[PDB]
Amino acid sequence: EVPTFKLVLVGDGGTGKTTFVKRHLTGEFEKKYIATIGVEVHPLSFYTNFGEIKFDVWDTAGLEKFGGLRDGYYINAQCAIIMFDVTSRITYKNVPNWHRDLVRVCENIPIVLCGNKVDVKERKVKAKTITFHRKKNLQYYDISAKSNYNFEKPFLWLARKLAGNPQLEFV
Amino acid sequence: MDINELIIGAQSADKHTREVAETQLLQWCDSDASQVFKALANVALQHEASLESRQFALLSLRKLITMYWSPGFESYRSTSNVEIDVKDFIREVLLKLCLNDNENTKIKNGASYCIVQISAVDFPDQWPQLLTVIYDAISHQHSLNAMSLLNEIYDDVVSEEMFFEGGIGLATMEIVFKVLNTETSTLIAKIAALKLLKACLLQMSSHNEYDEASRKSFVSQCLATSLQILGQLLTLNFGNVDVISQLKFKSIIYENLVFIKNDFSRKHFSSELQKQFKIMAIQDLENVTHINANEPLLETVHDCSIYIVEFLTSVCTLQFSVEEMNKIITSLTILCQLSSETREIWTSDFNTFVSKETGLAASYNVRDQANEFFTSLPNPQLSLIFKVVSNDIEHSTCNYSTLESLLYLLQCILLNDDEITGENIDQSLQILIKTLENILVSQEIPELILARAILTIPRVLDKFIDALPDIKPLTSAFLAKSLNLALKSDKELIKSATLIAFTYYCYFAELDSVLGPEVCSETQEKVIRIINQVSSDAEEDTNGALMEVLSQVISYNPKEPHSRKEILQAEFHLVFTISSEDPANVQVVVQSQECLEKLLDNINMDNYKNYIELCLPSFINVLDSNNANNYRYSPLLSLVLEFITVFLKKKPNDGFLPDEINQYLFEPLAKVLAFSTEDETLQLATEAFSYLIFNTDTRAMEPRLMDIMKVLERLLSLEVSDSAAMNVGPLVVAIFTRFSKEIQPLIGRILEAVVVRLIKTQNISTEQNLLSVLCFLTCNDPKQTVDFLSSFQIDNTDALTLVMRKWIEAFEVIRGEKRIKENIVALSNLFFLNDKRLQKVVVNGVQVPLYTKIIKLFVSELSFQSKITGLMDVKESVVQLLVRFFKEVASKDVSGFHCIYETLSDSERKVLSEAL
Ligand SMILES: Nc1nc2c(ncn2[C@@H]2O[C@H](COP(=O)(O)OP(=O)(O)OP(=O)(O)O)[C@@H](O)[C@H]2O)c(=O)[nH]1
Ligand SMILES: [Mg+2]
């Protein structure tokens, strides 16, 4: 009876997808970059004024040497988040490939573009991040895992787009 | 062995089944790839199989091709088993799937991806059948599946060497032209052909500054043919029964034209064609605006209009006829009108309005493209079109359905850098300002029209500041009205519009000189009241705009003998509250830093006492409330520390900091340095504490020496990270510069702590910081430092030899002149001691005397220079240090230097002799 939505996390290594998912799952934040092999499936539960939304996040590996059968995971997905570190402009430059591979396997799904770790130093990609989403109708959010700047916004937007009720809000 | 079982298990969410399924798949395919590839192709071709399984089969075949196809891949795995008999089969399977119109889009996409992966190595020379089948299907059957396949092929794998020297370019261009020229081809086929044209243009544009006539002629001919064909297509017409497809057709046509115009040399795109396509694009705006009167339809209308306006922006350098200009305005008014969904969103949530108007919104409507269009216009066209938009505004004062869009176009025109001048604008601008005043004065006006009036008036005044003789009274009246209409209404959107208008007034007018001190004070009070009312519901980067407006307000803070204390207290209350709410927003943080700096530029030791009691108790409460969590990382804690450090750093130059601030800050700063562990928290707290020590009065700090020393010992003890320990330098510098007499009994503890942390730490930057600290210690008192280092032992071994080894190794690693100078002066001071107990230690990096290696390294530095610690800044170049060192040496302090020079290479001795 409880609705469930499959979420695939994509983005290069070092963009803090695992820290973001772990923060949502437990509230702890782990400081040491450990590589991810394959994918980890984590059930996230968000309470709302209109019942429960329960995403099943697929934390896909961001390293090509570890991305074994990575495209095999996007099948029958219902939403996706493209993560990139604003500290590494190459990751933003590689974001279009992530969007291409996402829309190939599951087209027209709601996809959120998330610039992780705005807190580190100063933005190295500045406002260029607006250029990609403005055409493909993604929504860009500055988020972080060291500080909870916007950590709930991507899931809130995905819940609004999937449940069809823009007035839904997390509590 | 059952491929279906593997492809079912691999999709399972549970870790165990997925990993074992993938391991079995890889082991099977490494054992015999020919069977696995054939099975995957079969289950991809079996229409009876579930779509998820077919798509997983194709996406797994894509990966297996990357590993076992053939050498030349950067990840090709040895001992493949894919004989040509399997490749020929699966190529046929893929080129059957990728163009079977009955197949679902996902399977076609997977097949095209696999074909692209194969073509990354096998194309074109190994697989001409691919190109033969694509060209056959496109030219004879107009199969848009094959056109999409070719378009994706050009995206990933085709390169300019294949495009120009190979047959790809000419053949593709001929096929595309043949498809476009024939009227029989369906509109969707034309769209696919134009997408192929766009890909070919991108191929021609990626390389530039060509140097081969074989390419230039081909490019020029293809450009001429493509422009002729696009003109013919734009001259073609449709029955308007498939308007969404016509909108996509026009959208891709103008995308091609904007690409040609913006990314190719002007030579190939004649100005006559510019003038023709200008008229064509204007007629297409008219057509799209008529079509719009008929939700996905509106979206495609806006998408097509964006590209048409982009083309007009590129052409904009051309002259626009008055009737063409009027058509452009009449179309942009219909196109720039706010959708009912956006009107509802702005009415219900002013935060989206603030995000959009501040330019931080994650969107790009037709309105932004119109802004770009009017911004790019040249001065004559801008001056003509301003009259048109002003006349349309004047005639449409009662037409509230469109007036908002007219005000937006007027704003966009006034954003243009060029100064609008013309024959009779003076009459026009008077009518315009009277209309805006009537809009402000009127009642029952829709809130969005009023909000557009409020933001347009500052642009009107700014653009025509050189033409209005009554600019001061008009600015005063309009500002007063904008503030009154925000105070006297409950629509927070209007309040946000008013504060944005206020920051636009601040960016052009010196309000503090035109309004007068009393009017300026009253406007500051009104704006802070508005900000206070708005802050109760701020979100989504509304706080950043509030902070910017507050910065502009405090930038007009009156002189100290006249400033109102209550206004300043409210200003600080706002800059604190708005930044404490949503503290993680980096923009809010930096703007609050700038606001505090602006609020503390006008301080003195008299009023600084009043500033202490206002500011400090707010920070002390947060420091106390963070004590329970052991001062762990938190955005609010870092924020209050970054405010404390700014308040300290903005010291009154008249003299030392008052004892009051020291008595306030010492206890919580000591506690956070003694208990915290987060790197950022320790760094900020050390930055504050060191400055407090450096600028505290000597007689006030003397009783607290033991506490300071204990804090330093903890801050460099092992239970804190080395990166946080990096900041130890400034604290020791402040201690020595402050306690210049009391440090004598306890200096041994400092040396012990520095040397122990130096020998423990691995981190390079931490090693450098401890080396700087030890350098400062040695330069202050070389005798005590050497006595302690030689006498004290760690792990039953004297510290001296280990620290010499690490010091010389790090100096050999150290870079940057600033750090080199400190080591230069330290080693020279050690040399000038002339005590045998140092120089008799043997060191190697051949074993040589310690002083000998010191002078050898100094020589090596002099050879290098021949061509940020700042703890010993003297602002003197390394060259004069070197020459004074060698001249003191040549003054024969110790005779060993001559023996070493004769031992050293003749070239080095010659370099020394030529340097001095
Ligand atoms: N400063 C800062 N560091 C962060 C933030 N989020 C994560 N990190 C750190 O950056 C690294 C991110 O690690 P992961 O979450 O595994 O990164 P990833 O790209 O998802 O890694 P893979 O899953 O292996 O591809 C870790 O060292 C985190 O502690 C953040 O918001 N700010
Ligand atoms: Mg990871």
Side-chain angles (χ1 to χ4, degrees):
Chain A
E1 191 277 325
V2 186
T4 187
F5 304 121
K6 176 170 176 180
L7 182 63
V8 291
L9 266 290
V10 304
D12 291 331
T15 69
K17 305 183 312 293
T18 311
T19 61
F20 175 78
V21 172
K22 180 176 289 173
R23 178 172 279 281
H24 283 289
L25 185 65
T26 65
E28 302 176 338
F29 154 78
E30 190 276 331
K31 293 179 179 179
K32 293 179 179 179
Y33 173 25
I34 293 169
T36 303
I37 308 85
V39 298
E40 320 274 11
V41 176
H42 297 294
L44 304 185
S45 279
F46 296 104
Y47 305 111
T48 74
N49 63 7
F50 293 141
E52 191 166 0
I53 303 299
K54 183 160 64 176
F55 293 100
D56 339 296
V57 298
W58 286 60
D59 182 25
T60 68
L63 287 168
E64 172 56 288
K65 66 181 177 184
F66 297 152
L69 277 296
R70 182 173 56 231
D71 304 324
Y73 303 142
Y74 308 155
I75 297 89
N76 192 31
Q78 293 145 324
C79 54
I81 290 163
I82 301 163
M83 200 72 67
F84 68 93
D85 215 336
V86 176
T87 300
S88 279
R89 185 179 296 113
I90 294 169
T91 307
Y92 175 71
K93 194 202 101 153
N94 200 31
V95 161
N97 301 315
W98 290 119
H99 180 259
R100 184 211 291 300
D101 311 315
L102 280 168
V103 65
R104 181 185 291 115
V105 185
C106 51
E107 67 277 11
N108 76 59
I109 57 150
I111 296 169
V112 184
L113 181 71
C114 292
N116 209 359
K117 311 190 201 57
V118 65
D119 306 68
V120 174
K121 299 171 186 176
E122 292 177 350
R123 304 261 291 290
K124 198 166 180 179
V125 185
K126 297 166 57 182
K128 324 162 161 203
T129 68
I130 296 183
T131 300
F132 183 68
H133 79 267
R134 64 171 61 151
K135 44 171 174 175
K136 324 292 291 163
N137 298 286
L138 282 71
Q139 273 214 0
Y140 174 65
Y141 288 92
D142 311 336
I143 79 164
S144 179
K146 191 162 199 165
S147 73
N148 304 338
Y149 172 34
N150 268 325
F151 83 114
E152 283 180 333
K153 293 288 170 285
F155 296 103
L156 181 43
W157 188 85
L158 292 177
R160 287 177 180 157
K161 287 284 294 185
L162 295 168
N165 287 337
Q167 294 177 335
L168 179 150
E169 191 146 40
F170 295 0
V171 298
Chain B
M1 321 175 298
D2 187 2
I3 184 61
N4 298 267
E5 293 303 318
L6 271 56
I7 62 170
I8 288 290
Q11 307 180 58
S12 179
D14 62 358
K15 187 64 167 170
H16 183 74
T17 306
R18 178 172 64 255
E19 290 291 359
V20 73
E22 287 170 16
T23 307
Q24 284 178 323
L25 190 76
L26 303 183
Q27 188 280 342
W28 183 15
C29 183
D30 213 38
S31 176
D32 184 5
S34 76
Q35 288 179 331
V36 185
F37 276 59
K38 192 163 180 286
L40 288 171
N42 284 318
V43 299
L45 201 43
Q46 288 159 23
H47 313 277
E48 304 78 18
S50 56
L51 183 143
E52 311 96 20
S53 287
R54 298 187 68 206
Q55 194 180 21
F56 187 89
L58 296 166
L59 299 181
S60 63
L61 178 59
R62 186 269 186 189
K63 186 62 171 181
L64 271 61
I65 283 162
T66 306
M67 293 197 332
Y68 308 139
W69 191 254
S70 64
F73 289 103
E74 301 89 338
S75 186
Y76 169 76
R77 183 170 289 201
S78 182
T79 316
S80 68
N81 199 37
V82 192
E83 182 206 0
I84 312 304
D85 293 351
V86 176
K87 300 184 182 174
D88 288 348
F89 184 65
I90 62 170
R91 287 174 182 161
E92 183 182 332
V93 175
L94 287 176
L95 62 83
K96 182 176 185 173
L97 292 168
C98 74
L99 57 83
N100 174 1
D101 197 50
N102 303 280
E103 286 290 6
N104 173 292
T105 306
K106 289 177 178 176
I107 297 89
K108 302 193 306 181
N109 278 357
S112 304
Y113 193 13
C114 294
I115 293 164
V116 163
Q117 189 61 186
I118 292 166
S119 303
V121 299
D122 286 350
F123 179 91
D125 75 21
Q126 305 294 336
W127 193 9
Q129 299 96 320
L130 201 173
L131 293 163
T132 303
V133 176
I134 289 181
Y135 295 141
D136 178 334
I138 300 181
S139 68
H140 301 296
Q141 296 294 321
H142 301 150
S143 184
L144 61 93
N145 304 284
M147 291 155 108
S148 173
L149 175 61
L150 188 57
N151 189 24
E152 207 180 14
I153 281 177
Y154 291 167
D155 282 358
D156 303 338
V157 300
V158 178
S159 185
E160 293 82 3
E161 301 86 299
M162 271 165 268
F163 187 68
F164 292 119
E165 293 83 3
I168 301 299
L170 178 58
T172 308
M173 282 325 307
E174 185 171 18
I175 293 283
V176 168
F177 296 150
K178 189 173 190 292
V179 177
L180 298 181
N181 285 349
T182 55
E183 81 296 330
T184 289
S185 56
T186 57
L187 185 56
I188 310 174
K190 287 185 168 78
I191 290 155
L194 293 155
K195 290 181 184 184
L196 276 172
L197 176 68
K198 180 176 59 168
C200 298
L201 295 173
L202 197 151
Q203 296 310 290
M204 299 168 174
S205 168
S206 53
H207 274 89
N208 197 244
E209 293 83 4
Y210 289 105
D211 60 355
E212 183 161 359
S214 175
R215 301 186 174 182
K216 284 162 211 263
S217 60
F218 164 76
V219 171
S220 179
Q221 181 54 232
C222 290
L223 286 174
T225 302
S226 55
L227 296 172
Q228 172 198 327
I229 284 170
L230 297 154
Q232 178 172 342
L233 273 48
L234 290 182
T235 60
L236 188 153
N237 288 337
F238 304 92
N240 290 318
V241 301
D242 194 355
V243 295
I244 192 170
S245 305
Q246 279 104 52
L247 290 170
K248 288 177 172 194
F249 179 65
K250 293 179 179 179
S251 189
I252 193 66
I253 285 166
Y254 295 107
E255 186 167 72
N256 281 289
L257 279 74
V258 299
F259 191 76
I260 300 175
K261 178 56 185 180
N262 298 324
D263 273 298
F264 284 32
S265 66
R266 204 191 81 261
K267 204 172 61 73
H268 307 106
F269 182 76
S270 179
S271 300
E272 182 65 26
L273 290 172
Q274 296 199 86
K275 304 172 41 43
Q276 180 63 97
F277 291 122
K278 186 189 76 190
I279 296 177
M280 295 299 291
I282 292 170
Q283 286 297 133
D284 184 1
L285 288 184
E286 180 72 6
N287 268 292
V288 172
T289 52
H290 296 308
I291 287 178
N292 195 40
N294 290 45
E295 190 174 271
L297 190 153
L298 172 66
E299 182 65 26
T300 52
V301 161
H302 279 232
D303 306 336
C304 177
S305 298
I306 291 167
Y307 285 107
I308 299 159
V309 180
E310 190 172 30
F311 183 68
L312 294 175
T313 307
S314 294
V315 166
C316 82
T317 62
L318 277 296
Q319 323 314 325
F320 295 94
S321 296
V322 68
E323 182 67 344
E324 301 307 309
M325 185 180 288
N326 173 41
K327 290 171 189 171
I328 296 172
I329 297 312
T330 306
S331 303
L332 283 178
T333 56
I334 310 305
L335 296 171
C336 291
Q337 263 184 40
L338 295 165
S339 296
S340 184
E341 65 183 1
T342 45
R343 185 176 285 265
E344 161 57 19
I345 287 163
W346 294 3
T347 295
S348 179
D349 213 28
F350 74 87
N351 300 20
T352 62
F353 176 81
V354 176
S355 302
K356 182 67 181 294
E357 291 296 310
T358 300
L360 305 175
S363 298
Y364 193 93
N365 294 3
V366 181
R367 292 173 70 108
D368 305 80
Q369 188 63 45
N371 187 309
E372 281 266 330
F373 173 59
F374 294 107
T375 297
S376 298
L377 288 163
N379 194 57
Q381 304 309 313
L382 182 72
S383 66
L384 276 296
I385 191 166
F386 169 85
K387 301 192 301 173
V388 182
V389 298
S390 62
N391 184 246
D392 273 358
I393 282 164
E394 163 63 359
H395 287 176
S396 312
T397 61
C398 304
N399 190 354
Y400 300 164
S401 84
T402 187
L403 180 61
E404 191 278 350
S405 74
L406 284 163
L407 296 179
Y408 184 74
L409 282 71
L410 175 66
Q411 178 182 333
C412 294
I413 280 163
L414 301 164
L415 299 192
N416 188 319
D417 298 345
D418 301 341
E419 301 266 340
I420 294 167
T421 61
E423 51 256 60
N424 189 359
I425 297 169
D426 296 324
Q427 291 282 14
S428 296
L429 61 83
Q430 285 296 330
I431 291 161
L432 184 59
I433 62 170
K434 285 179 65 176
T435 302
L436 296 161
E437 177 187 323
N438 272 270
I439 294 174
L440 302 193
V441 166
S442 170
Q443 313 88 51
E444 308 181 5
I445 189 74
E447 74 180 83
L448 297 190
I449 293 165
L450 178 52
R452 280 294 172 212
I454 293 163
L455 282 72
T456 294
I457 292 155
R459 306 309 189 168
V460 171
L461 300 176
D462 178 15
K463 179 54 60 177
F464 295 117
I465 194 172
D466 293 308
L468 273 64
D470 51 352
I471 183 65
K472 183 191 75 173
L474 281 183
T475 301
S476 188
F478 278 121
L479 182 55
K481 294 307 309 187
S482 302
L483 300 170
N484 291 357
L485 277 296
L487 292 175
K488 294 176 166 63
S489 80
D490 48 358
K491 296 162 183 174
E492 287 168 319
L493 180 141
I494 299 182
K495 299 184 195 282
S496 304
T498 290
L499 65 85
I500 289 166
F502 189 81
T503 187
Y504 297 165
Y505 284 109
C506 297
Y507 293 0
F508 83 80
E510 291 266 310
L511 291 184
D512 70 350
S513 305
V514 300
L515 304 180
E518 61 275 40
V519 182
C520 189
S521 166
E522 183 178 1
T523 52
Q524 293 179 176
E525 188 170 359
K526 288 188 171 179
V527 180
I528 67 185
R529 287 166 65 189
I530 285 155
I531 293 172
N532 186 19
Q533 290 176 0
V534 175
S535 75
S536 308
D537 291 331
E539 203 155 66
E540 294 165 25
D541 291 331
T542 290
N543 284 323
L546 307 191
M547 211 65 58
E548 181 186 28
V549 179
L550 187 51
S551 183
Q552 319 311 346
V553 174
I554 62 170
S555 198
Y556 303 123
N557 204 337
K559 314 332 301 173
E560 292 94 304
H562 195 69
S563 177
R564 297 285 75 78
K565 303 184 192 180
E566 198 67 26
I567 297 169
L568 188 153
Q569 295 189 22
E571 283 176 9
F572 178 77
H573 184 293
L574 292 174
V575 65
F576 185 68
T577 301
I578 302 168
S579 179
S580 183
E581 183 178 1
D582 197 24
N585 170 346
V586 183
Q587 295 297 109
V588 167
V589 176
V590 65
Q591 292 190 62
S592 304
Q593 310 299 128
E594 291 176 20
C595 290
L596 189 60
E597 291 161 7
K598 276 173 156 67
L599 190 52
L600 294 171
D601 278 335
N602 66 316
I603 62 170
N604 56 29
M605 293 177 70
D606 180 19
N607 193 22
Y608 194 110
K609 324 272 211 163
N610 306 318
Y611 276 96
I612 297 169
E613 201 272 347
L614 174 58
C615 296
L616 279 289
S618 307
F619 308 152
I620 305 321
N621 287 297
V622 174
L623 295 180
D624 192 45
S625 304
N626 278 270
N627 189 359
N629 298 321
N630 298 330
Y631 306 88
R632 54 181 71 270
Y633 185 84
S634 173
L636 172 60
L637 175 60
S638 299
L639 180 71
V640 297
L641 294 161
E642 209 186 324
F643 288 171
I644 289 162
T645 192
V646 169
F647 198 99
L648 291 169
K649 210 174 201 298
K650 299 298 290 181
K651 74 173 186 178
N653 302 106
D654 307 335
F656 292 165
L657 292 172
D659 294 2
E660 321 196 300
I661 190 167
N662 188 44
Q663 183 154 230
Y664 278 30
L665 285 180
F666 193 102
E667 272 68 46
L669 284 183
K671 287 191 292 179
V672 62
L673 296 170
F675 297 120
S676 195
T677 188
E678 295 302 320
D679 289 345
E680 295 302 320
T681 309
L682 287 176
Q683 173 202 24
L684 290 165
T686 302
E687 199 192 87
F689 187 70
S690 57
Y691 201 94
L692 178 67
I693 301 299
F694 184 39
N695 294 276
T696 301
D697 191 0
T698 57
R699 65 187 57 82
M701 201 45 98
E702 172 269 306
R704 302 188 168 271
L705 185 59
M706 301 185 328
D707 303 348
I708 295 165
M709 291 295 218
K710 190 173 63 176
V711 169
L712 166 65
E713 187 174 327
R714 194 272 182 172
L715 172 43
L716 61 83
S717 187
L718 297 180
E719 60 262 65
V720 307
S721 302
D722 282 352
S723 177
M726 293 180 183
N727 311 141
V728 65
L731 176 59
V732 190
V733 165
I735 285 182
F736 273 21
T737 56
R738 195 48 55 223
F739 290 90
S740 314
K741 294 162 41 43
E742 302 89 327
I743 55 165
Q744 298 301 326
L746 301 179
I747 189 159
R749 293 174 59 176
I750 316 174
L751 276 296
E752 170 161 5
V754 175
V755 302
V756 65
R757 189 55 169 255
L758 183 63
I759 70 172
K760 294 312 251 173
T761 183
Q762 287 69 240
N763 174 289
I764 298 298
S765 304
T766 304
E767 293 179 354
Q768 291 175 5
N769 278 281
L770 281 293
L771 294 174
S772 305
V773 171
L774 201 43
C775 178
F776 172 53
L777 301 163
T778 57
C779 80
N780 189 359
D781 306 278
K783 314 192 81 73
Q784 290 188 357
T785 51
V786 65
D787 284 335
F788 202 96
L789 272 49
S790 58
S791 63
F792 179 63
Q793 297 201 326
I794 297 89
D795 193 16
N796 307 317
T797 309
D798 64 285
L800 187 62
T801 189
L802 306 175
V803 302
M804 294 300 293
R805 299 292 183 184
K806 192 69 155 164
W807 194 353
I808 62 170
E809 182 174 5
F811 184 15
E812 271 175 79
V813 173
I814 281 163
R815 59 88 174 173
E817 196 185 352
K818 286 175 180 174
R819 310 190 187 76
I820 296 162
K821 286 174 296 190
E822 293 179 353
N823 284 272
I824 290 289
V825 72
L827 289 186
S828 53
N829 267 280
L830 297 191
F831 193 12
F832 293 8
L833 195 58
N834 313 127
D835 186 329
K836 56 185 177 191
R837 64 181 293 165
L838 285 156
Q839 68 188 105
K840 298 305 186 175
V841 178
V842 290
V843 298
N844 189 18
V846 188
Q847 293 72 224
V848 299
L850 197 158
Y851 274 10
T852 297
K853 201 84 176 176
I854 287 172
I855 67 184
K856 193 166 188 173
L857 291 172
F858 274 12
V859 166
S860 76
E861 299 324 300
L862 188 153
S863 192
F864 182 76
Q865 63 84 30
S866 76
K867 181 162 58 176
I868 68 164
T869 53
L871 308 190
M872 271 285 328
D873 178 17
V874 180
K875 200 57 174 176
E876 66 180 359
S877 182
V878 71
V879 289
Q880 64 76 239
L881 290 185
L882 284 156
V883 298
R884 74 161 211 171
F885 172 70
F886 292 101
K887 74 179 61 182
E888 182 65 26
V889 175
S891 307
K892 298 190 301 185
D893 289 347
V894 174
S895 304
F897 71 84
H898 182 74
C899 313
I900 301 311
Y901 286 7
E902 295 303 310
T903 300
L904 293 172
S905 308
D906 182 46
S907 179
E908 304 285 50
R909 179 66 179 86
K910 191 181 179 174
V911 176
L912 269 63
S913 310
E914 79 195 350
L916 73 165

